[PDB]
Amino acid sequence: AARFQVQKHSWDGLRSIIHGSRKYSGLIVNKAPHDFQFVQKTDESGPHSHRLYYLGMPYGSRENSLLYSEIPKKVRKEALLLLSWKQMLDHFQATPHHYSREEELLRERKRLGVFGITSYDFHSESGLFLFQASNSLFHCRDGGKNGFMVSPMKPLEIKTQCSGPRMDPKICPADPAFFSFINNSDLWVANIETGEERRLTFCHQGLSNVLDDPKSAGVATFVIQEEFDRFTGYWWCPTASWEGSEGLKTLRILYEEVDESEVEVIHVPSPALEERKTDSYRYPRTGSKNPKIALKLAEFQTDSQGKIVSTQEKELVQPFSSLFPKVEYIARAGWTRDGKYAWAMFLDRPQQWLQLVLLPPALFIPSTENEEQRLASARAVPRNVQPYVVYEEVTNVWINVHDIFYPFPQSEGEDELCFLRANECKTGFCHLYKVTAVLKSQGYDWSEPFSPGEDEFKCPIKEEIALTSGEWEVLARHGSKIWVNEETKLVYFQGTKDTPLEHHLYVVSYEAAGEIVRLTTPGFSHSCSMSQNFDMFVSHYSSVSTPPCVHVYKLSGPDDDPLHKQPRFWASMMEAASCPPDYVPPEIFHFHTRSDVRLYGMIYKPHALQPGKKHPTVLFVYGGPQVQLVNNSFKGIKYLRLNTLASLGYAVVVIDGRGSCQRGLRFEGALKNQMGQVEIEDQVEGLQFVAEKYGFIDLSRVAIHGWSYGGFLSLMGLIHKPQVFKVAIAGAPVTVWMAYDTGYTERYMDVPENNQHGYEAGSVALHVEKLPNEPNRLLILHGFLDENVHFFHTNFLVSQLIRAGKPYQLQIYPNERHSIRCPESGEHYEVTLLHFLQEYLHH
Amino acid sequence: ARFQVQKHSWDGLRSIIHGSRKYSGLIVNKAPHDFQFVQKTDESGPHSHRLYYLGMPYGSRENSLLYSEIPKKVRKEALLLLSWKQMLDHFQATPHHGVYSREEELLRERKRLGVFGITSYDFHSESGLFLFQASNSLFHCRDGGKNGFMVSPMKPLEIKTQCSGPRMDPKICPADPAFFSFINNSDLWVANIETGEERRLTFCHQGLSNVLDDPKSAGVATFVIQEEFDRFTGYWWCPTASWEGSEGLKTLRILYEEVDESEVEVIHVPSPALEERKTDSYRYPRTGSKNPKIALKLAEFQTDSQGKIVSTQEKELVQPFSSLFPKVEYIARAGWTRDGKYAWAMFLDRPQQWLQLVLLPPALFIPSTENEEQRLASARAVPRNVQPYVVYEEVTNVWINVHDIFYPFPQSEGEDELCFLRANECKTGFCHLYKVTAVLKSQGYDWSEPFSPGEDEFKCPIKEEIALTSGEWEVLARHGSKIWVNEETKLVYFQGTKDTPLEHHLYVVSYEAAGEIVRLTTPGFSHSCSMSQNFDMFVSHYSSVSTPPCVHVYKLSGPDDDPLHKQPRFWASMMEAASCPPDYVPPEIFHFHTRSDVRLYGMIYKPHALQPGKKHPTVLFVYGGPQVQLVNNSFKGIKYLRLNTLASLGYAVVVIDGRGSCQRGLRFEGALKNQMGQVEIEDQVEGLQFVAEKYGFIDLSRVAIHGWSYGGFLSLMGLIHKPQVFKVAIAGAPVTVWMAYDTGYTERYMDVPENNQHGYEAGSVALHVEKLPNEPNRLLILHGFLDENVHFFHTNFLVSQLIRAGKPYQLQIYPNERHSIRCPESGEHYEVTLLHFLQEYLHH
Numbered sequence A: 001a002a003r004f005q006v007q008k009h010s011w012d013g014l015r016s017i018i019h020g021s022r023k024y025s026g027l028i029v030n031k032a033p034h035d036f037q038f039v040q041k042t043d044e045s046g047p048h049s050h051r052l053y054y055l056g057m058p059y060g061s062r063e064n065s066l067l068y069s070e071i072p073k074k075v076r077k078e079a080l081l082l083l084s085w086k087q088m089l090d091h092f093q094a095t096p097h098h099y100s101r102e103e104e105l106l107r108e109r110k111r112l113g114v115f116g117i118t119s120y121d122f123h124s125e126s127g128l129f130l131f132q133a134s135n136s137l138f139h140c141r142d143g144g145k146n147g148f149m150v151s152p153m154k155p156l157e158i159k160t161q162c163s164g165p166r167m168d169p170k171i172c173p174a175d176p177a178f179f180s181f182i183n184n185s186d187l188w189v190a191n192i193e194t195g196e197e198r199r200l201t202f203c204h205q206g207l208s209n210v211l212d213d214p215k216s217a218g219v220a221t222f223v224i225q226e227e228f229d230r231f232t233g234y235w236w237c238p239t240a241s242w243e244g245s246e247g248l249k250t251l252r253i254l255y256e257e258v259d260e261s262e263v264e265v266i267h268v269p270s271p272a273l274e275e276r277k278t279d280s281y282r283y284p285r286t287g288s289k290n291p292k293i294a295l296k297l298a299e300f301q302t303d304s305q306g307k308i309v310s311t312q313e314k315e316l317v318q319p320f321s322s323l324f325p326k327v328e329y330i331a332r333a334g335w336t337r338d339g340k341y342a343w344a345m346f347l348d349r350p351q352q353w354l355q356l357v358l359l360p361p362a363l364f365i366p367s368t369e370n371e372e373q374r375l376a377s378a379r380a381v382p383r384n385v386q387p388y389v390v391y392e393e394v395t396n397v398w399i400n401v402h403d404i405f406y407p408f409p410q411s412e413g414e415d416e417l418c419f420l421r422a423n424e425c426k427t428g429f430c431h432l433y434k435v436t437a438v439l440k441s442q443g444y445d446w447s448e449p450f451s452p453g454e455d456e457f458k459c460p461i462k463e464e465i466a467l468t469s470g471e472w473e474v475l476a477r478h479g480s481k482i483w484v485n486e487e488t489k490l491v492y493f494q495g496t497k498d499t500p501l502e503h504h505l506y507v508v509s510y511e512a513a514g515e516i517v518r519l520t521t522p523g524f525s526h527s528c529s530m531s532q533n534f535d536m537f538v539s540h541y542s543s544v545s546t547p548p549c550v551h552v553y554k555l556s557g558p559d560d561d562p563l564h565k566q567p568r569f570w571a572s573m574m575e576a577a578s579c580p581p582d583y584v585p586p587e588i589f590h591f592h593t594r595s596d597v598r599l600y601g602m603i604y605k606p607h608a609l610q611p612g613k614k615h616p617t618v619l620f621v622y623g624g625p626q627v628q629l630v631n632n633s634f635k636g637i638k639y640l641r642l643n644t645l646a647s648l649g650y651a652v653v654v655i656d657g658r659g660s661c662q663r664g665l666r667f668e669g670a671l672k673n674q675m676g677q678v679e680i681e682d683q684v685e686g687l688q689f690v691a692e693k694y695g696f697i698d699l700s701r702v703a704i705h706g707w708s709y710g711g712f713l714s715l716m717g718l719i720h721k722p723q724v725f726k727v728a729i730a731g732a733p734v735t736v737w738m739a740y741d742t743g744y745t746e747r748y749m750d751v752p753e754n755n756q757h758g759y760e761a762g763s764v765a766l767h768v769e770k771l772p773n774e775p776n777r778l779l780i781l782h783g784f785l786d787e788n789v790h791f792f793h794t795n796f797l798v799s800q801l802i803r804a805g806k807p808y809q810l811q812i813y814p815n816e817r818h819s820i821r822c823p824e825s826g827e828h829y830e831v832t833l834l835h836f837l838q839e840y841l842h843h
Numbered sequence B: 001a002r003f004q005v006q007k008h009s010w011d012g013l014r015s016i017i018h019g020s021r022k023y024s025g026l027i028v029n030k031a032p033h034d035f036q037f038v039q040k041t042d043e044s045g046p047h048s049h050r051l052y053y054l055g056m057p058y059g060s061r062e063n064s065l066l067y068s069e070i071p072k073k074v075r076k077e078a079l080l081l082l083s084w085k086q087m088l089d090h091f092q093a094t095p096h097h098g099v100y101s102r103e104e105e106l107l108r109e110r111k112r113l114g115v116f117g118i119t120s121y122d123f124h125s126e127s128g129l130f131l132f133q134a135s136n137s138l139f140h141c142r143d144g145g146k147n148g149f150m151v152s153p154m155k156p157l158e159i160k161t162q163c164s165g166p167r168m169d170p171k172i173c174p175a176d177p178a179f180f181s182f183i184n185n186s187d188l189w190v191a192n193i194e195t196g197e198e199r200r201l202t203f204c205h206q207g208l209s210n211v212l213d214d215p216k217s218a219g220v221a222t223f224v225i226q227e228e229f230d231r232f233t234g235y236w237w238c239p240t241a242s243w244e245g246s247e248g249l250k251t252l253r254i255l256y257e258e259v260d261e262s263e264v265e266v267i268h269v270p271s272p273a274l275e276e277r278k279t280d281s282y283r284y285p286r287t288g289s290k291n292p293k294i295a296l297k298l299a300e301f302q303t304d305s306q307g308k309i310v311s312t313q314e315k316e317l318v319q320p321f322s323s324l325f326p327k328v329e330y331i332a333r334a335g336w337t338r339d340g341k342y343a344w345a346m347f348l349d350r351p352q353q354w355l356q357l358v359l360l361p362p363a364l365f366i367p368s369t370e371n372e373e374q375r376l377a378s379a380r381a382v383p384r385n386v387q388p389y390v391v392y393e394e395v396t397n398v399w400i401n402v403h404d405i406f407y408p409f410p411q412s413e414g415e416d417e418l419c420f421l422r423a424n425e426c427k428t429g430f431c432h433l434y435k436v437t438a439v440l441k442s443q444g445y446d447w448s449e450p451f452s453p454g455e456d457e458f459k460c461p462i463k464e465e466i467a468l469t470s471g472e473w474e475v476l477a478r479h480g481s482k483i484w485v486n487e488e489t490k491l492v493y494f495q496g497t498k499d500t501p502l503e504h505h506l507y508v509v510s511y512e513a514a515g516e517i518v519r520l521t522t523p524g525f526s527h528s529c530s531m532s533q534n535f536d537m538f539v540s541h542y543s544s545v546s547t548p549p550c551v552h553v554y555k556l557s558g559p560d561d562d563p564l565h566k567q568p569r570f571w572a573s574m575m576e577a578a579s580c581p582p583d584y585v586p587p588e589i590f591h592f593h594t595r596s597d598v599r600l601y602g603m604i605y606k607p608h609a610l611q612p613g614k615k616h617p618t619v620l621f622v623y624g625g626p627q628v629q630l631v632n633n634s635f636k637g638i639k640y641l642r643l644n645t646l647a648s649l650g651y652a653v654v655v656i657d658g659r660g661s662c663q664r665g666l667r668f669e670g671a672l673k674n675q676m677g678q679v680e681i682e683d684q685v686e687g688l689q690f691v692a693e694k695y696g697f698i699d700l701s702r703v704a705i706h707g708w709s710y711g712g713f714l715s716l717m718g719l720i721h722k723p724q725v726f727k728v729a730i731a732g733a734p735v736t737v738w739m740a741y742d743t744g745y746t747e748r749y750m751d752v753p754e755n756n757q758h759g760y761e762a763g764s765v766a767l768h769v770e771k772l773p774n775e776p777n778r779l780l781i782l783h784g785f786l787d788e789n790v791h792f793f794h795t796n797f798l799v800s801q802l803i804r805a806g807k808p809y810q811l812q813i814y815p816n817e818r819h820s821i822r823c824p825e826s827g828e829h830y831e832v833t834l835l836h837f838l839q840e841y842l843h844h
């Protein structure tokens, strides 16, 4: 019956509430160990079965370092073993003073907040570790022949004569004496033992005008990093070969060569604000030119002493653009484990057609200006050498790039490739298939200019067995992977089989496809890392009510029944923090829309709730593709401010409407070509359901708040439902889809020329006449340095608001990119949110 | 008791502001300007003169070239309104969507030009040639002279070019109007307008793809020169031809500034095409950092009797500019003597406390060459009696204000001396006219021998220095003000504050027998005048606080034997004063004496329909910076209608010209030296407290402070230093960190940062955010995103500091505006926002 009134605090009152909420949280940000490597110990006398390597922030450190824990052979059943974190590196400052533009932008794109060592490459046979640290390259050795340290060793720096940063370092799998890196947009190798360095590619001239120097080798460009989650542009061949009678060893690297010549240039302000300068970006806006791309092959020869004797740039016998004319993007690439084939995952520009293509090294010839030498090379390419399209995925929705492709070893003289593949477009749910392609030879004259027909290189599919099926998903994106045991014929995977609210670890046979066994405990969402010996796994898991823990599990039982190996709790890497007394978990619910679609939501109930009270409500919204807000995992680290709102007496509602992920392609596909037009309808149905079910929602006092897609929908809510939403707080909103990039926008909306109606309807800056004529209903927030949702979106929205004579409030975070990382900015944002709601969320 | 302003809806405030601004859009940029008088030489015709000018008549959406006919006789008992005749037949001078090239766009911003169309023209009276920019190209037309006077609009002929990109700063050759000059891609060109021959004279710009590796320009005024020294050209035609060639060839000369910006810091400012998401690069000398390396050079070319360009030559000083003039940081001004015998330059040191006027004979310049032997031969051939002459030197412990008045007389006494009129402020601390005679005595120099000049090298003996004016008032010599000299009558016409600092008047004094100064303009108005070169007629553009501007033509009439006492007789009107709206109430000017016994002027907009015993919420509208006077007897309804609008809603509006403001002498302006922020607020608070005591209707518990640029800076300073005086601040385009501002402005008033760490720290509001309010809705920041003078950086940095100090703030940005709000939608939104912020938050 009655309306609850939030206590109005002074600004300094709100500062103390926010500072207190964070400072006395009873939770620490990014404390979990990660990037796990299991190594077996081979001392029968010793007490430890394994050493476990990982990245983590040890006790009395402010930065990530390389750590190990000892896994004992036996544990007391009636006792909880907390593994001690041992340092690998002796008192070593990995972080630079107070990063370069290259390292800074990479941390923004990989969503990395923590300081210090953020990744390492590891070679198990040799026990070599390789990593970036102190704006240089370092390495150390542990296990293998050398044996296991019992105290922190000092990491050996790798000296260079190169100018500028050495990026994306990787150990050569065939010979760990060698590693690769990118320097000034070109691929280099070095011998880590001898210290010899050698440039392999010569794309980057190093010209004074950078915009006249538009080619790179081995580099993932802006859209590939930001929209396709690929951070490398080169891949070591896993094997050596032995061509020529001189006894030389050949090592190979597949790399993407890019030319950004025709790609539009935008300027984004640089983080040194006092310098009043911008950085230049090759930013493909929707409908404009993406980079020109090709796959190429770098080869070098080595003697028995490890000297680099010769190097060669090799390219496809006919141009990439001739062989693969419909390919806009290379999503992924790699090699078969025998090095027999390079492979690439190719996408068309509409992102409705994917090909998995094998490329034999024999299809690549030496790069040359000499047309006669090139023709001699092309004449020598055998007729039986060709690309093989071993898999093709087609959809009328869009291809989500799935990272799961596992090719099995071939027999000698076998013209088939068996592989595991995650495929969503077949059933509309991402599932594991065992595929057998026949490598069909047509015979090709590579000396003639090439024009591929329909189904050029297309391999017959002899067999395609569903290992999984149903209205749930195998997780195949954004870090999710499979692990394959070829001894037991088992594939381990993560999925939503038990519930869309929880990630679980599962195992199924790929030989006798049948029973799926769950390996993780229901009531938690799990993120797992499996030992390459399939004897142990780590689970990073949480629930809405329980902060995250990291536990080590032993897979135990008879070796003759590997599918039914039992997960046994073994030891803890990190115990769950106490759920704070001031923190009240949200409650997950579900409802059916008027169209009988099931939606999940969660509610943060006003704290110390009294009956007969209607409370002012904040609808917290993301609502975009590739994200699920509502699941059974701990929200108090990333979304503490929602608990803070509930503590002051706001109800907080979160709805996963149509367009959100982990519900299949059809569910996500509801927003195709009509972003903005359907998401608000589901949000309002959720709000009305929560009001009817729970009874404490004041529908006369609803705020809408979100960031990025959530900022976009906050403005759309005020435009389409001005009687529902009293106020909107729009953080980093997309306001004009024509200003957003190719990779994201075209996937969901097509190009502007093909979807004028959708682009117009979905661009909030073109509908400012429908925004409120009353002041204090709209707050816009934006990081000045945002390289994803450019400040331009807010600038253009403001320009339109002025033209339409509409009021607005604005806050800028001058030192922030897309997400607020600095504590002062984060606190100021939260204080501003509390102040805006207390002053302006009224009936 | 407390008056409460009526609370309106946002759309209510939009209606009030939209209604108010109909009047301003009727009168703003309506005045004709850039006047040229030409006498008619036809006794049969009814007109004594044709008067050319720029104007936007009612209906037109752009400025065009116009003329009016001045009749020989007028009815004494009738007011003649002159007809505005078009020169150009249905011609769009404005480009498509009013989108100018970056060069033309930035020049309009720096010259404060609001109108579209033709904004300037070059005129050659003998030939009747007009030359002007239009439609991102160059045009010309002819009228008067040999050709005779048009009776209907002619079509302007475009000048064809093979040059790529804009042709900037076009000028007619005074010696030969067949030739004109222009700048193309940072180099000086000349062209023959009759033949169409074009020739590049300078080769500073390599045209490299990396622009930052291409840092030299010729003929160009750089960023600080345009923004802070009010100079928009970097070259000067020699007014005469010479004939030193024995093939009967004619030599024409151009003096030009060559600059090297190699060492100057680079900043990026967003470009006005927001959707392109790009910036333009600027060579921005921040205070304490490097200015451009500069030199004066000489471009020569030879022409035959048929007007063909036979040859060209780049010439430079026989010893480097940096050797001859080692303490010179800036070229303020340059030109020639009327006979072309000497180039001259006005040089400033880096502290801007030492100015030199220097003659440079063309003989001191030798051909540019890489060949060291040829250079030494050239240097040896320079006569020993050729040298620079420092004819005048101004020194001060305050600062040099660059005065545009330097009038060299022809050398009618002989070659040993130069007589000149000069405006000088540092001598008495008030800007006054002096007649100076310098002695030009050759020391004898071997120019092939290197020499480092000592103190007072080239310094001329001063034979005579007569004060033509004196007292505690100013001759106006800056920002458009000039003198006119009639050498027949020995009279100099000037504008000044002799009658009152509140009014500009036209005056005349003899430079032969300096004595009585005669005022030619009517008291009770401030006048802006244009004098005929024949001294028979003048125009006055004039207004008062109560009367909108009019433009009247006056005849100077009376006996020719007594020219000093010629009567100004009203002849005709170019523009009558508009009717004021009924709800426009003029502000009231007052003065008061500070506790230190300094007289300060202010004005008050009284709340409309004021009732006694009521205290009203108050807006202190502030600029408070150097080079500006807000309080004078001129019409404020064009630029400051919004102050009347505030008064109509029941706000009191107060304006105080504190110490630091101009038109009160160097000592008064000098009060803020090395301590910007620290004295201006004290005077603002004394003014406010005086107005509250004198007028009795000021609620001192409800005062807002509001200003733009220096006024934005002082709005923040008021909130920091006087938080109990100012309930709210609205800070527009504030300077928040003086260390981020430029060399020319900041060093003049504040020295370099290393010499004035205390003053820079105390005056930088972004470094004192801890003292800004912990209560919301006391601070509104406004800034144009594209501001190329007060960079958005100032607001961005202030916000970054406010966040770190945990302070609340409100922010509005004008994404499509540079420094000043030019778009009507932006202007309306600003004024609506101002009224909303005051109605909601100016309380208690």
Ligand SMILES: *C(=O)C(CC)(CC)C(=O)Nc1cccc(CN2CCN(Cc3cccc4cccnc34)CC2)c1
Residues within 6 Å of the ligand: A111, A226, A227, A478, A479, A624, A625, A626, A627, A707, A708, A709, A710, A734, A788, A789, A818
């Ligand atoms: C704003 O909404 C934009 C721009 C930044 C689009 C307008 C946006 O969000 N774009 C976008 C691009 C690529 C991928 C995504 C979705 N990812 C967001 C980050 N997320 C990491 C993550 C979050 C929660 C839990 C979790 C658990 C395991 C691994 N990762 C995560 C992955 C999805 C959005």
Ligand SMILES: *C(=O)C(CC)(CC)C(=O)Nc1cccc(CN2CCN(Cc3cccc4cccnc34)CC2)c1
Residues within 6 Å of the ligand: B112, B227, B228, B479, B480, B625, B626, B627, B628, B708, B709, B710, B711, B735, B789, B790, B819
């Ligand atoms: C802001 O205050 C800054 C930055 C834009 C300094 C922080 C500023 O104002 N700078 C500045 C630089 C050079 C010269 C000036 C002073 N001029 C301003 C324009 N003004 C034209 C003018 C205005 C009103 C009346 C009037 C009457 C006759 C002639 N001109 C004018 C001339 C002075 C400021």
